[PDB]
Amino acid sequence: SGFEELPLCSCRMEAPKIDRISERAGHKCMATESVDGELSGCNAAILKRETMRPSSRVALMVLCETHRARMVKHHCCPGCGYFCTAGTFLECHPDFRVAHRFHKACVSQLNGMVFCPHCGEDASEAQEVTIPR
Ligand SMILES: [Zn+2]
Ligand SMILES: [Zn+2]
Ligand SMILES: [Zn+2]
Ligand SMILES: [Zn+2]
Numbered sequence: 001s002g003f004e005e006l007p008l009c010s011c012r013m014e015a016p017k018i019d020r021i022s023e024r025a026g027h028k029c030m031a032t033e034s035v036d037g038e039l040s041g042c043n044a045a046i047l048k049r050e051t052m053r054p055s056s057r058v059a060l061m062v063l064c065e066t067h068r069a070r071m072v073k074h075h076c077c078p079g080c081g082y083f084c085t086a087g088t089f090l091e092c093h094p095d096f097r098v099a100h101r102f103h104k105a106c107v108s109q110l111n112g113m114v115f116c117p118h119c120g121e122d123a124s125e126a127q128e129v130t131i132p133r
Helices: 065-072
Strands: 032-035 038-041 087-095 098-102 108-110 113-115 127-131
Touching: none
Parallel strands: none
Antiparallel strands: 032 038, 087 098, 087 127, 108 113
16 A cells, blocks of 8 residues: 555666577667557667666567667656657656656556556656657
């Protein structure tokens, strides 16, 4: 029932390159962009072979430098693992020029209430945002 049970994201964590994830991907970025439910790939050439993911709900990804930059800004949804770069989505604003992006359907849920899946702040606080492509 308490805040301690809320999941927090892993957007800032990095896993070592010991599982050959980059090699199986051809050293191409594994990011998936979501724009109002339309999914698209990246496959840009990667520079670092360490892997990342916003939560353990999804598999680890090797990423291009642009998508690693967006991942550490909490622009990837921990619920589904898709990046929120354009279209409509929710943003939690814990501090100046900090935005945690996520889909309305991907909020954390505890005791019937909804929370930011990055940081655990109440999601009724979350603003709806529309960003052009
Ligand atoms: Zn990429
Ligand atoms: Zn995050
Ligand atoms: Zn999502
Ligand atoms: Zn948050």
